[PDB]
Design a protein around this ligand. Structure first.
Ligand code: NJG
Lengths: 99, 99
């Protein structure tokens, strides 16, 4: 699809078999989701944003579908203010900026 | 043009008579710029992201040129680690997400 930006680019994602809403975020290197239960092993990591750093659980090689497009990559889980889909997965679904 | 997301979508902008590098950021409602001494009146604001909130100064009707495309609107100025062009100006230069 072509998504205009007069509204937040929110889309439905599927991860761990559960549906969620997330924000397509070209300013995010990484994908960061709010607290949730995910199967498999994880490692603790730190990520920084505009307001400082937070602790997250890093899940590697996770299946995640974004608006019907499949991706498999790293998902960070922690106290983010909103679910954000970052460039690590946007590249996988073939997302570009155009003007 | 078309910008892929393999790397950060950094572009050159012109604001306040200065050239700067900024991210085309679909995850930001408004534009947020690193500390700079803009003239004119402003309004305090708080914006929240990963890590928490920062205090910024809101300037209205500020002219910005983004890759040769003129825009005018709200710019938030504060101790952000990066300049981000948000949706308030991305819409004005005709920027869409595509996949
Ligand atoms: C809550 C939704 C997102 C988080 C909101 N942010 C935009 C988002 O693109 C930031 C931009 C950014 C910030 C600092 C360094 C680098 C990039 N990226 C980000 O945090 O990414 C994380 C994960 O990947 C890593 O790579 C880069 C950092 C890591 S914001 O800046 O905090 C923001 C909040 C409110 C407003 C107001 O206008 C109302 O929207 C505008 C902007």
């Amino acid at each position: 699809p072509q998504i205009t930006l007069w509204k937040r680019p929110l889309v439905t994602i599927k991860i761990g078999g559960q549906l969620k809403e997330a924000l397509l975020d070209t300013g995010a290197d990484d994908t960061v989701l709010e607290e949730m239960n995910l199967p498999g092993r994880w490692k603790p990591k730190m990520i920084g944003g505009i307001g400082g750093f937070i602790k997250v659980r890093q899940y590697d090689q996770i299946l995640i579908e974004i608006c019907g497009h499949k991706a498999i990559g790293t998902v960070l889980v922690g106290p983010t203010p909103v679910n954000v889909i970052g460039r690590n997965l946007l590249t996988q679904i073939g997302c570009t900026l155009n003007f």
